Amino acid sequence: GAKKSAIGQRIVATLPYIKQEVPIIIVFRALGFVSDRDILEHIIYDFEDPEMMEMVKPSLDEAFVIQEQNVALNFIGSRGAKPGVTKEKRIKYAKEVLQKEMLPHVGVSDFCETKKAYFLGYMVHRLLLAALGRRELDDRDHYGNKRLDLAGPLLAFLFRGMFKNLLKEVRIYAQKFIDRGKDFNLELAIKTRIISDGLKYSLATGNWGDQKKAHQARAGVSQVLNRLTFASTLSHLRRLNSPIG
């Protein structure tokens, strides 16, 4: 059709915990930047690039409507996991998502917007460079783009959940024993069986996860050591794995 044919390409962002896609200018405005000049300062670093400017123009043509942080936040939060019946709660949910689940590695404090905007602009800039044929697309098989989860990371990820469950159980016990108002004890509130049995089970079976949820748990970690020959033992102890089906 005529309008799609004239627009060509548009840039959209798939934020986590949001029902469907969002145009990028909406997210940038939700961060608190209103002026197209400022948004293009965050995205296009050198303004003497007319091809990049023309490429980003159709993305800015979706800003014809949205012009303010409040309405941008409303538009973002309209598509939550459970859409609200009110509007203030939806806007608070939108702000919470943009502060907690979008780019956690940049920051989670209150004043992290000035850096989240720069990093999101860098993502968009790299996308533009890829679309213009100025940088090579990445390949997933390159080994600089990989990490290896050894015993440290594996057991730490496993232990986080068990400590969280232990905290939940002691919290439940404390509340139940305190609503009576009589007293409260510590040793009786802690179930060591949680941690002990969880670690022992995950190491014994190989299903990396909780016992109740051994369906999506990735099986194949924690194999039983090969002892046919010394070379077999060594080559078993130095072994990798690609989770591809």
Binding site: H142, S232, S235
Partner: protein, 195 residues
């Protein structure tokens, strides 16, 4: 410590930077988080490599990459990167010397070892995506020497090219006279022999 050194070494931060002084500056990423910009990338890289070789501020495990064309410096302190040691070639001569070799061959009753070799700045750990900015030589006394010039700017050297094989494939004799499926089959059958 890396962030502190970066601050000490005149690295302008993002919130203190006008969006006009970024076109001609090379962005700095630390653990994938953009922390600032710098205007002297070459001297910055020289200083960082010197500090890593001295083992003073930056541990030997940390990797540093400079993307010269795209003007980016990436420093990783992450866990899970895979790396292997390489010898260092300064101009065209290995920094490894006969004094190092003798002190190593007197290793007993001398408390001189691999750590004391690393601390001298002779060898180095290179991970996979730092290998993309390095020039390697397979054999010193064959590739550093004067020839019909192929490359005169070697940056590292291999210890021995036969260290590319695993545990089970290090027992095959003359694997370079074999066929690759045969080497794979022997790697499989080495775990089934009885001894």
């Amino acid at each position: 410590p890396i962030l502190e050194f970066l601050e000490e070494w005149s690295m302008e931060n993002l919130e203190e930077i006008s969006p006009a002084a970024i076109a001609d500056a090379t962005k700095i990423f630390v653990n994938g988080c953009w922390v600032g910009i710098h205007k002297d990338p070459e001297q910055l890289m020289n200083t960082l490599r010197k500090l890593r070789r001295q083992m003073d501020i930056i541990v030997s495990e940390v990797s540093m990459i400079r993307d010269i064309r795209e003007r980016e410096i990436r420093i990783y302190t992450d866990a899970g990167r895979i790396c292997r040691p390489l010898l260092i070639v300064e101009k065209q001569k290995l920094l490894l010397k006969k004094r190092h070799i003798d002190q190593l061959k007197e290793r007993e009753y001398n408390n001189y070892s691999w750590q004391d070799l690393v601390a001298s700045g002779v060898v180095e750990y290179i991970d996979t995506l730092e290998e993309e900015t390095v020039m390697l030589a397979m054999t010193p006394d064959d590739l550093q020497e004067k020839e019909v010039a192929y490359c005169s700017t070697y940056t590292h050297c291999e210890i021995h090219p036969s260290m590319i094989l695993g545990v089970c494939a290090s027992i095959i004799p003359f694997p370079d006279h074999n066929q690759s499926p045969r080497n794979t089959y022997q790697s499989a059958m080495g775990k089934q022999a009885m001894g």
